[PDB]
Design a protein around this motif. Structure first.
Motif, PDB file in Angstrom:
ATOM      1  N   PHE A 230     -60.658 -41.311 -46.047  1.00  0.00           N
ATOM      2  CA  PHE A 230     -59.282 -41.665 -45.723  1.00  0.00           C
ATOM      3  C   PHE A 230     -59.086 -41.807 -44.220  1.00  0.00           C
ATOM      4  O   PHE A 230     -58.468 -42.765 -43.756  1.00  0.00           O
ATOM      5  CB  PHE A 230     -58.306 -40.630 -46.278  1.00  0.00           C
TER       6      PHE A 230
ATOM      7  N   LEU B  53     -60.579 -29.883 -67.074  1.00  0.00           N
ATOM      8  CA  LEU B  53     -61.415 -30.963 -66.563  1.00  0.00           C
ATOM      9  C   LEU B  53     -60.804 -32.321 -66.884  1.00  0.00           C
ATOM     10  O   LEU B  53     -60.797 -33.218 -66.041  1.00  0.00           O
ATOM     11  CB  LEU B  53     -62.829 -30.868 -67.141  1.00  0.00           C
TER      12      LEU B  53
ATOM     13  N   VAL C 193     -63.064 -32.968 -51.952  1.00  0.00           N
ATOM     14  CA  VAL C 193     -61.806 -33.010 -51.216  1.00  0.00           C
ATOM     15  C   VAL C 193     -62.053 -33.403 -49.762  1.00  0.00           C
ATOM     16  O   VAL C 193     -61.395 -34.298 -49.231  1.00  0.00           O
ATOM     17  CB  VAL C 193     -61.073 -31.653 -51.265  1.00  0.00           C
TER      18      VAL C 193
ATOM     19  N   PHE D 211     -57.966 -32.701 -64.661  1.00  0.00           N
ATOM     20  CA  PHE D 211     -58.475 -32.999 -63.327  1.00  0.00           C
ATOM     21  C   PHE D 211     -58.748 -34.490 -63.154  1.00  0.00           C
ATOM     22  O   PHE D 211     -58.464 -35.061 -62.103  1.00  0.00           O
ATOM     23  CB  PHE D 211     -59.745 -32.191 -63.055  1.00  0.00           C
TER      24      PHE D 211
ATOM     25  N   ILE E   5     -57.708 -23.781 -59.537  1.00  0.00           N
ATOM     26  CA  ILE E   5     -57.247 -23.778 -58.153  1.00  0.00           C
ATOM     27  C   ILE E   5     -55.731 -23.935 -58.069  1.00  0.00           C
ATOM     28  O   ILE E   5     -55.173 -24.914 -58.566  1.00  0.00           O
ATOM     29  CB  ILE E   5     -57.909 -24.901 -57.330  1.00  0.00           C
TER      30      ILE E   5
ATOM     31  N   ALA F  45     -64.574 -38.879 -54.383  1.00  0.00           N
ATOM     32  CA  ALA F  45     -63.640 -38.103 -55.192  1.00  0.00           C
ATOM     33  C   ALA F  45     -64.316 -37.435 -56.386  1.00  0.00           C
ATOM     34  O   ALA F  45     -64.117 -36.246 -56.635  1.00  0.00           O
ATOM     35  CB  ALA F  45     -62.499 -38.987 -55.664  1.00  0.00           C
TER      36      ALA F  45
ATOM     37  N   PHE G 198     -55.236 -23.133 -53.307  1.00  0.00           N
ATOM     38  CA  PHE G 198     -54.995 -24.563 -53.168  1.00  0.00           C
ATOM     39  C   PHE G 198     -54.874 -24.918 -51.693  1.00  0.00           C
ATOM     40  O   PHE G 198     -55.393 -25.938 -51.245  1.00  0.00           O
ATOM     41  CB  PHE G 198     -53.731 -24.974 -53.928  1.00  0.00           C
TER      42      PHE G 198
ATOM     43  N   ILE H  86     -67.643 -24.647 -59.611  1.00  0.00           N
ATOM     44  CA  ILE H  86     -66.669 -25.689 -59.912  1.00  0.00           C
ATOM     45  C   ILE H  86     -65.776 -25.894 -58.696  1.00  0.00           C
ATOM     46  O   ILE H  86     -65.609 -27.016 -58.218  1.00  0.00           O
ATOM     47  CB  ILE H  86     -65.804 -25.349 -61.140  1.00  0.00           C
TER      48      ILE H  86
ATOM     49  N   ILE I 166     -54.049 -42.988 -52.503  1.00  0.00           N
ATOM     50  CA  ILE I 166     -54.723 -43.174 -51.223  1.00  0.00           C
ATOM     51  C   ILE I 166     -54.862 -44.653 -50.884  1.00  0.00           C
ATOM     52  O   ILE I 166     -54.589 -45.071 -49.758  1.00  0.00           O
ATOM     53  CB  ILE I 166     -56.119 -42.523 -51.223  1.00  0.00           C
TER      54      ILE I 166
HETATM   55  C1  LIG Z   1     -61.751 -34.834 -54.733  1.00  0.00           C
HETATM   56  C2  LIG Z   1     -60.738 -34.905 -53.606  1.00  0.00           C
HETATM   57  C3  LIG Z   1     -59.269 -34.502 -53.865  1.00  0.00           C
HETATM   58  C4  LIG Z   1     -58.452 -35.747 -53.471  1.00  0.00           C
HETATM   59  C5  LIG Z   1     -58.892 -34.089 -55.289  1.00  0.00           C
HETATM   60  O1  LIG Z   1     -59.558 -33.428 -56.058  1.00  0.00           O
HETATM   61  O2  LIG Z   1     -57.661 -34.537 -55.781  1.00  0.00           O
HETATM   62  C6  LIG Z   1     -56.562 -33.630 -56.077  1.00  0.00           C
HETATM   63  C7  LIG Z   1     -56.317 -33.292 -57.565  1.00  0.00           C
HETATM   64  C8  LIG Z   1     -57.006 -34.056 -58.674  1.00  0.00           C
HETATM   65  C9  LIG Z   1     -56.111 -31.727 -57.740  1.00  0.00           C
HETATM   66  C10 LIG Z   1     -56.233 -31.066 -56.325  1.00  0.00           C
HETATM   67  C11 LIG Z   1     -56.520 -32.261 -55.326  1.00  0.00           C
HETATM   68  O3  LIG Z   1     -55.415 -32.363 -54.401  1.00  0.00           O
HETATM   69  C12 LIG Z   1     -55.606 -32.945 -53.157  1.00  0.00           C
HETATM   70  O4  LIG Z   1     -56.607 -32.676 -52.522  1.00  0.00           O
HETATM   71  C13 LIG Z   1     -54.484 -33.878 -52.722  1.00  0.00           C
HETATM   72  C14 LIG Z   1     -54.523 -34.218 -51.212  1.00  0.00           C
HETATM   73  C15 LIG Z   1     -54.835 -35.676 -50.826  1.00  0.00           C
HETATM   74  C16 LIG Z   1     -55.434 -35.834 -49.418  1.00  0.00           C
HETATM   75  C17 LIG Z   1     -55.799 -37.263 -49.020  1.00  0.00           C
HETATM   76  C18 LIG Z   1     -54.942 -37.823 -47.884  1.00  0.00           C
HETATM   77  C19 LIG Z   1     -54.027 -38.936 -48.354  1.00  0.00           C
HETATM   78  C20 LIG Z   1     -57.257 -29.894 -56.155  1.00  0.00           C
HETATM   79  C21 LIG Z   1     -58.725 -30.325 -56.366  1.00  0.00           C
HETATM   80  O5  LIG Z   1     -57.250 -29.469 -54.792  1.00  0.00           O
HETATM   81  C22 LIG Z   1     -57.865 -28.536 -54.036  1.00  0.00           C
HETATM   82  C23 LIG Z   1     -56.867 -28.324 -52.935  1.00  0.00           C
HETATM   83  O6  LIG Z   1     -58.372 -27.592 -54.599  1.00  0.00           O
HETATM   84  C24 LIG Z   1     -57.033 -28.601 -56.955  1.00  0.00           C
HETATM   85  C25 LIG Z   1     -56.960 -28.464 -58.468  1.00  0.00           C
HETATM   86  O7  LIG Z   1     -58.266 -28.557 -58.996  1.00  0.00           O
HETATM   87  C26 LIG Z   1     -58.710 -27.547 -59.866  1.00  0.00           C
HETATM   88  O8  LIG Z   1     -57.973 -26.592 -60.180  1.00  0.00           O
HETATM   89  C27 LIG Z   1     -60.140 -27.773 -60.347  1.00  0.00           C
HETATM   90  C28 LIG Z   1     -60.222 -28.810 -61.477  1.00  0.00           C
HETATM   91  C29 LIG Z   1     -60.934 -28.218 -62.673  1.00  0.00           C
HETATM   92  C30 LIG Z   1     -56.050 -29.470 -59.138  1.00  0.00           C
HETATM   93  O9  LIG Z   1     -54.768 -29.318 -58.563  1.00  0.00           O
HETATM   94  C31 LIG Z   1     -56.403 -30.987 -59.071  1.00  0.00           C
HETATM   95  O10 LIG Z   1     -55.613 -31.579 -60.129  1.00  0.00           O
HETATM   96  C32 LIG Z   1     -54.952 -30.590 -60.901  1.00  0.00           C
HETATM   97  O11 LIG Z   1     -54.940 -31.019 -62.204  1.00  0.00           O
HETATM   98  C33 LIG Z   1     -55.856 -29.356 -60.739  1.00  0.00           C
HETATM   99  C34 LIG Z   1     -55.200 -28.055 -61.214  1.00  0.00           C
HETATM  100  O12 LIG Z   1     -57.113 -29.526 -61.364  1.00  0.00           O
END
Ligand SMILES: C/C=C(/C)C(=O)O[C@H]1C(C)=C2[C@H]([C@@H]1OC(=O)CCCCCCC)[C@@](C)(OC(C)=O)C[C@H](OC(=O)CCC)[C@@]1(O)[C@H]2OC(=O)[C@@]1(C)O
Ligand code: NA
Length: 994
Positions: A776, A253, A769, A256, A829, A306, A834, A761, A267
């Motif tokens: 965006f 977390l 996302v 994250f 994820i 976000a 992913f 979660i 962004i």
């Molecule tokens: C709220 C919206 C999105 C933007 C988000 O969460 O941010 C990323 C980011 C922080 C990670 C990503 C998100 O990646 C994106 O979505 C990038 C694309 C940008 C698109 C916009 C166009 C310019 C997570 C969310 O993507 C999806 C695809 O699942 C998965 C995962 O998250 C987890 O495993 C859950 C966290 C406990 C994390 O890669 C995570 O970071 C890593 O540390 C993890 C391991 O955390």
């Protein structure tokens, strides 16, 4: 003096230069106080209310929300219009969440109690000393007591400091050192020095420890150490130095948040890079004040989109309910985040007595000597029925009922068990059963002599309460107990000096009755009882005795054996010093072996299967016991830790063996060991460290202050419900029933919860996302805002909160405990998953934006606005002829946002169903597998319509009730999200499962 136990009373007085009769001089008190400080553990860090509130704004995500609240506040200020009823709403809601979030964080620290402060429960307010400035004793504050002080304690007093006993004024001195260990059995103290400088506290028979109680007696002593230098203070320092890492979920977390911050920033740069073309726009014309507000409006929305604002609340709710569930299974979890860690448990280190076993002792076998005739020898083995403390059972020889009185050897056998005993029985009229009074071991002897009845006393005529101590009392009237030589681990035995009853004018006829560990006692036996006769101890006979002992202890019986001997001609009463416990072994020499009793501390009925569950679950189980290595290993084989015929030479160690190993071989031993016997005080913490050096999520049991640092160090410290208050506060979970099976049940429950936790979660973050993409897209294309912060917040807190919470009630897999422990580093994820949410998010972002764009264009209720002008909507107020038609205020209509929101809501209701299983299709695992989930969705929609019709609400969220045709369009674009994920699930099941 930290080694005052090894020094004589004269040496301790000499060290500080204090007179035992007068005490410390006022100058000495001054000098000693300044040198050693006050006798008190240091005060905890008084975290102020203001400092506590600030900590709630130290998280990265709550700082982003704080920043997004400021921009929203400024934008709600610098604006042209009269409708402020829906202007300052947005920045206020964001602030409210932060405040509410801050309120909770304060409420926790207010109710949280650390174990370090629980140690101060054991430091008394007052203490009695003798100082030179007064003749009589003066009771002062315990904190004002200094090393070198002459102190006095009596029955009831709580020991103020670590004290070297100088003189015992009463007959004997009993001390309750229960706060250190678990055995509340008071120990006897003396004044003679203990030779070993590196002696453990248990063997320091001349010391009083700060925090313990004087069970009986009154004595005088000199203060050796105070404050943190005491045994309990040295433990406090170990706990303070122990740094507990965050749970794996907390680390993910936190990770994250770190990355979500980067993304958010990226962004913003992307939005700027796309709109670089504004640099080629004329300086004259347009509004840079309206162009800035737009880029700041989407920034606030970007942040809110976000952050999973509802996630920390949903997590807490799931854990709190799981905690209530675990409580019913006798598992009292104290820390909510520990539930996850509990499910990752790779190694469980449990104490045997009371946890793996019932701590309900019972004599099963016993044998006396039947015949010694040269090289020939025969014993008389017997068996006893009844595993309870009740005097209900018979004695058998070769499975045949016999009379104990017909064996003279057994009469002497029972005599020893009754007299050499500080325990008794008592029939509880409230419960209706026979309960023990004293040690479980000694009480087992009390029960035995009631079953034997060597004198055939009429016991079937007595009541139930008088039945308890019947055959015992008969034996007590025979011999008069002069005194008892207490047990000590150096000789591992105890004895009693007895004189005949009818003997008022005689000095000949005394007897000593000894009991204890077989090895030591038999080595001191120069004779052997054969009925009433006596023969000299010989080689072949001694081997015959030791063999059976080895068989009973190391065999499948797993019995704790006690040797019983009598000294026929004890030393004269006058030639014995009863104060010098060092001379006790000497007093117990030239013995005559009578017999050996074998007693069982039976394993719990549920342990056998619970151990197997751990093997299935890839959870290693380590036993920690007080048994000797041989019996320890035997008990492991019995309960299923060890195979009945497997090699364990490198998987079982004693405390001494463990110490004799170098640090490199010690770390190696812990990764393969499953049995630790005769463990030294510092070993529990050391084992945990070594287990942690292999990244093992370690569970550890304990019940005293001695085990407190180990409980704090281990990922899941486990305390007994019958344990001490400090041990409990130093632990993550409390076993209400002290049962090992409770631990395993808790771990399984811990796995089931986190699996469902993984779902909501991933479900909530998946929504965020899609929301970000929407923000965006609406910023990249230059479209009017489809979703506003106020709407997104209602979704993330309420609309998506309810299905998320319901996803925590997903039915657990049937193969929960048929799988290895989850790796802490396992991401929530990644990989194909992913990509799935990368696709789902892209779908949601397009659907919500598309739904708003659909209203501006191809809608009957909407205008005939084309795409080229919808992207230049900020120029309609100025360049009117370019976009001639209707009003410019239609670009701020509530209908297209409602279309976007309703689409967002509907999709997330569908995506909630998609979150029932990671890969299994809805055709395989139907939506009605979770009834709670369906109910939550119905409520979420009812709340959606609530903010669409109840007049005060749609104004706030800027919404308008959709037409039946418009609602159909919502379903046309939302529902196929199930099909998309279904395909992605299909690809995962058939082209990745390798
Ligand atoms: C709220 C919206 C999105 C933007 C988000 O969460 O941010 C990323 C980011 C922080 C990670 C990503 C998100 O990646 C994106 O979505 C990038 C694309 C940008 C698109 C916009 C166009 C310019 C997570 C969310 O993507 C999806 C695809 O699942 C998965 C995962 O998250 C987890 O495993 C859950 C966290 C406990 C994390 O890669 C995570 O970071 C890593 O540390 C993890 C391991 O955390
Ligand atoms: Na701990």
């Amino acid at each position: 003096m930290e080694a005052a136990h090894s020094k004589s009373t004269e040496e301790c007085l000499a060290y500080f230069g204090v007179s035992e009769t007068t005490g410390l001089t006022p100058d000495q008190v001054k000098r000693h106080l300044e040198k050693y400080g006050h006798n008190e553990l240091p005060a905890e860090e008084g975290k102020s209310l203001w400092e506590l509130v600030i900590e709630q704004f130290e998280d990265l995500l709550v700082r982003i929300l704080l920043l997004a609240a400021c921009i929203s506040f400024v934008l709600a200020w610098f604006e042209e219009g009269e409708e402020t009823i829906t202007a300052f709403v947005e920045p206020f809601v964001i602030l409210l969440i932060l405040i509410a979030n801050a309120i909770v964080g304060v409420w926790q620290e207010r109710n949280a109690e650390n174990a370090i402060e629980a140690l101060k429960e054991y430091e008394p307010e007052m203490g009695k000393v003798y100082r030179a400035d007064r003749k009589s004793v003066q009771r002062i504050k315990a904190r004002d007591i200094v090393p070198g002080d002459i102190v006095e304690v009596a029955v009831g007093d709580k020991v103020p400091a670590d004290i070297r006993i100088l003189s015992i004024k009463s007959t004997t001195l009993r001390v309750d050192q229960s706060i250190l260990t678990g055995e509340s059995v008071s120990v006897i103290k003396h004044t003679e020095p203990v030779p070993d400088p590196r002696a453990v506290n248990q063997d320091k028979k001349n010391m009083l420890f700060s925090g313990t109680n004087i069970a009986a007696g009154k004595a005088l002593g000199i203060v050796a150490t105070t404050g943190v230098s005491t045994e309990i203070g040295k433990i406090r320092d170990q706990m303070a130095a122990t740094e507990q890492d965050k749970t794996p979920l907390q680390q993910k977390l936190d990770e994250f948040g770190e990355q979500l911050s980067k993304v958010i920033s990226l962004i913003c740069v992307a939005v700027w890079l796309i709109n670089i073309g504004h640099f080629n726009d004329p300086v004259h014309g347009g509004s840079w004040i309206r162009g800035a507000i737009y880029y700041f409006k989407i920034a606030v929305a970007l942040a809110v989109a976000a952050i999973p604002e509802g996630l920390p609340a949903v997590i807490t709710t799931c854990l709190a309910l799981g905690t209530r569930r675990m409580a019913k299974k006798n598992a009292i979890v104290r820390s909510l985040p520990s539930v996850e860690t509990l499910g990752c448990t790779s190694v469980i280190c449990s104490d045997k007595t009371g946890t793996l076993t019932t701590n309900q002792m019972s004599v099963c076998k016993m044998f006396i000597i039947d015949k010694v005739d040269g090289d020939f020898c025969s014993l008389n083995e017997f068996s006893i029925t009844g595993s309870t403390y009740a005097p209900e059972g018979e004695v058998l020889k070769n499975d045949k009922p016999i009379r104990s009185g017909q064996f003279d050897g057994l009469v002497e056998l029972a005599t020893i068990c009754a007299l050499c005993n500080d325990s008794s029985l008592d029939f509880n009229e409230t419960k209706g059963v026979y309960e023990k009074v004293g040690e479980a071991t000694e009480t087992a002897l009390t029960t035995l002599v009631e079953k034997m009845n060597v004198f055939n006393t009429e016991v079937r005529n007595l009541s139930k309460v008088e039945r308890a101590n019947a055959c015992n009392s008969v034996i007590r009237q025979l011999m008069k107990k002069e005194f008892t030589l207490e047990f000590s681990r150096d000789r591992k035995s105890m004895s009693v000096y007895c004189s005949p009853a009818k003997s008022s004018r005689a000095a000949v006829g005394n007897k000593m009755f000894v009991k204890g560990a077989p090895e030591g006692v038999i080595d001191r036996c120069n004779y052997v009882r054969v009925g009433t006769t006596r023969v000299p101890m010989t080689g072949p006979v001694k081997e015959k005795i030791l063999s059976v002992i080895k068989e009973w202890g190391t065999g499948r019986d797993t019995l704790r054996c006690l040797a019983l001997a009598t000294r026929d001609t004890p030393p004269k009463r006058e030639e014995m010093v009863l104060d010098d416990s060092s001379r006790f072994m000497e007093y117990e020499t030239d013995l005559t072996f009578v017999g050996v009793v074998g007693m069982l501390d039976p394993p719990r009925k549920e342990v056998m299967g619970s151990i197997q569950l751990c093997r299935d679950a890839g959870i290693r189980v380590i036993m920690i016991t007080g048994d000797n290595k041989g019996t320890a290993i035997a008990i492991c084989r019995r309960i299923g830790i060890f195979g009945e015929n497997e090699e364990v030479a490198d998987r079982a160690y004693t405390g001494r063996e463990f110490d004799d190993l170098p640090l490199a071989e010690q770390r190696e031993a812990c990764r393969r060991a499953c049995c630790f016997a005769r463990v030294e005080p510092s070993h529990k913490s050391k084992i945990v460290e070594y287990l942690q050096s292999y990244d093992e999520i370690t569970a550890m049991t304990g019940d005293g202050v001695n085990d407190a640092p180990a409980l704090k160090k281990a990922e899941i410290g486990i305390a007994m419900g019958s344990g001490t208050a400090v041990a409990k506060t130093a632990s993550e979970m409390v076993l209400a029933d002290d049962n090992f099976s409770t631990i395993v049940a808790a771990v399984e429950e811990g796995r089931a919860i986190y699996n469902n936790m993984k779902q909501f979660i991933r479900y909530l973050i998946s929504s965020n996302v899609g929301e970000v993409v929407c923000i965006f897209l609406t910023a990249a294309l230059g479209l009017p805002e489809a979703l506003i912060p106020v709407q997104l917040l209602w979704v993330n807190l309420v609309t998506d909160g309810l299905p998320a919470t319901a996803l925590g009630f997903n039915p657990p897999d049937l193969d929960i405990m048929d799988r290895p422990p989850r790796s802490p580093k396992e991401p929530l994820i990644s990989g194909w998953l992913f990509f799935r949410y990368m696709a789902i998010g892209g779908y949601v972002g397009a659907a919500t934006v598309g739904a708003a764009a659909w209203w501006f264009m191809y809608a009957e209720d909407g205008p005939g606005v084309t795409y080229h002008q919808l992207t230049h909507f900020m120029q309609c107020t100025e360049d009117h002829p370019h976009f001639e038609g209707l009003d410019c205020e239609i670009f701020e209509a509530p209908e297209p946002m409602t279309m976007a929101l309703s689409v967002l809501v509907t999709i997330e209701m569908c995506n909630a169903l998609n979150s029932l299983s990671e890969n299994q299709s809805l055709m395989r695992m139907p939506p009605w597998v979770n009834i709670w989930l369906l109910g939550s969705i119905c409520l979420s929609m009812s709340l959606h319509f609530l903010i669409l019709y109840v007049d005060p609400l749609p104004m706030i969220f800027k919404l308008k009730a959709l037409d039946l045709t418009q609602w159909l369009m919502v379903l046309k674009i939302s529902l196929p999200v199930i099909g998309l994920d279904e395909i992605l699930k299909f690809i995962a099941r058939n082209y990745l499962e390798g």
